[PDB]
């Protein structure tokens, strides 16, 4: 009988209950996004890594959901090395931030992909 | 005329105005719980040891009342050494937590016992 731990067990939505993505596993998530013809985008955040409620409290209002856009969505991208390259550029400029990869479906106007790709020190 | 102190005089509900339980006194509280045929359970907390009001303020709403369950309530327990053994296991895994022992009455669905059994450093 094991007790699920309590301390420093922050999670990050889709895929964060799995083992850490290897470089091959990260590659395959970007292939999957591109194979479905979704638009990739990178987002980053240094200050509020998790969701909170500072300015309002009514149903469905949360702060911390918006992060900041790295450049623009990569419209027309077909090459996974571009996505991975921009991830390396974001990391170099913001080594202290959380960085996620998202993929947009413009017909539904819904993100169909979202996962954490890099985490700063101690996370 | 003595003045009742103000600083670092946090209290912990039933039994916390008495001198610290000896090992024999702790054993006798566990015997009492088992002799009334109540189900023992351990609960622990590292972050918010005392009660507070973060998410709401209406009558009867407080944060900090729920702690986290150590394994499950020990249904059918009749041996005090099991309870004390789980307390030692909880302490070893969470030496920085507050740990309490509770006893449930399932007919009334009321905890009939609750007391602090271990306190972390400086408490």
């Amino acid at each position: 009988m094991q007790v699920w731990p309590i301390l420093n067990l922050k999670k990050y939505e889709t895929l964060s209950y799995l083992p850490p993505l290897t470089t091959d596993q990260l590659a395959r998530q970007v292939d999957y996004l591109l194979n479905n013809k979704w638009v990739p985008c990178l987002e980053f955040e240094t200050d509020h890594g998790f969701v909170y409620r500072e300015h309002h409290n009514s149903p469905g209002y949360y702060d911390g959901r918006y992060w900041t856009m790295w450049k623009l969505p990569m419209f027309g991208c077909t090459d996974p090395a571009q996505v991975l390259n921009e991830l390396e550029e974001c990391k170099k400029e913001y080594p202290n931030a959380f960085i996620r990869i998202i993929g947009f479906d413009s017909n539904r106007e819904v993100q169909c992909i979202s996962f954490i790709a890099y985490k700063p020190a101690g996370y | 005329m003595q003045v009742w102190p103000i600083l670092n005089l946090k209290k912990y509900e039933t039994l916390s105005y008495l001198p610290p339980l000896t090992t024999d006194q702790l054993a006798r509280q566990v015997d009492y719980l088992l002799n009334n045929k109540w189900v023992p359970c351990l609960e622990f907390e590292t972050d918010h040891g005392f009660v507070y009001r973060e998410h709401h303020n209406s009558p009867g709403y407080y944060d900090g009342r729920y702690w986290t369950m150590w394994k499950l309530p020990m249904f059918g327990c009749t041996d005090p050494a099991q309870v004390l053994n789980e307390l030692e296991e909880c302490k070893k895994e969470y030496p920085n937590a507050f740990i309490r022992i509770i006893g449930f009455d399932s007919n009334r669905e009321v905890q009939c016992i609750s007391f602090i059994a271990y306190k972390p450093a400086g408490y």
Binding site: - | M1, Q2, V3, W4, I6, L9, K10, K11, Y12, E13, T14, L15, S16, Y17, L18, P19, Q25, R28, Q29, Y32, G49, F50, V51, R53, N57, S58, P59, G60, Y61, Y62, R65, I102, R108, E109, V110, Q111, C112, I113, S114, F115
Partner: protein, 467 residues
Amino acid sequence: ASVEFKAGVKDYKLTYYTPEYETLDTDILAAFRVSPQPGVPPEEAGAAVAAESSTGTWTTVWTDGLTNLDRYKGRCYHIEPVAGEENQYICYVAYPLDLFEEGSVTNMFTSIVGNVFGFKALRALRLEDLRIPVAYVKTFQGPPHGIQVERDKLNKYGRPLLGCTIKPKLGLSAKNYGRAVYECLRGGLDFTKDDENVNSQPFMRWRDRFLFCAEALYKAQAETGEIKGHYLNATAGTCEDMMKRAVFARELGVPIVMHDYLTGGFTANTTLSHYCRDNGLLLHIHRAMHAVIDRQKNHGMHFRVLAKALRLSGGDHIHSGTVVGKLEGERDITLGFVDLLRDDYTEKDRSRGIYFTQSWVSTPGVLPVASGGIHVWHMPALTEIFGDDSVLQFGGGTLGHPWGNAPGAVANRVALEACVQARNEGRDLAREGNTIIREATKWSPELAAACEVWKEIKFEFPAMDTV
């Protein structure tokens, strides 16, 4: 099937004395202690009480034949002589479910206790008990919260709760009220309260007091780390005024308010009970005025009937007496109605004054409150009589302590925990009480000073209300 109308008077017992009737499980049953005038046979006295608390008047009325009198009539179905008494009987009366207004204690009292106590033909009448059928119980809300929910809201388990009335009953200002409340709460009491008659007055207006008592209670909560309440009184002259005070307590986010249910009344109290359920407020009930009605054995209404009525109308706490303190209450009678207030089921038990088996079909239980002339040396007996599910209140016992309110509160909290530990360890509170207290004085200077002041004080007098 329709007999002619015959005008004129005839005996009540021809229609309303019914010794072969079997009671229905939907009936309300009343046990009346009846003392007839000389020359009035017990059958006629019993019949008169049943008739005039249900369908009948003093002469025969033709309009009976438009209805079915036998399905609506109240009826005296059993008469039992009282041992050791000249001309005094227990008369049992049955009232059909259809006579009563759903959810209205007011209507139930109006019928059963309305006019019959002033009959010329009786010397005295006392309602001892009522059997409230489960089909009528289900028409009421009952307590707003009840015992289980109250402990879960407050996170308080494994000991009686501790309270305290602020003294000078009357005459303190709003700010001195809150000053006294902070110092009482910080020493280990869970609760403080308004005195039953502090409402709003020239020396202290209600809104000012609510506000200062909120600052004080929140300060004691933060210092100690334990949830605190102060019973803010909503009792008032009108329903509008009463509602305004419950509304401001709601706004302050505090856990508990109080009402004087007999002086305010049952129509008002049922209103407040419904508001407290709707708004998550605990409702403490004070029984001011009960002893006008319930003190004497020959005449009035026993407290157990008034306590059942409160459970229906609704309250989370009700004062129950202390047994050992300054106001009357016999041990066995008190244990009887404490069980009627807390439990789901109580069997007939004439040795504790329970005339009827009573079921509650899960109506929440009320917390009994023991208060009035008690102090640290009473703690062992109090804990033994009431057990964990009670509130023990020390007004004079806290604010009469030689070192002030905080040390007063410590002494009471230490004494109670000492008793709880000893009880839990197998010690006998009845026999080892003074030794348990004495042992705690060796490591608690606060309790030692309280013990010295009140060591001789006892309240021992002959009781007026015995089985």
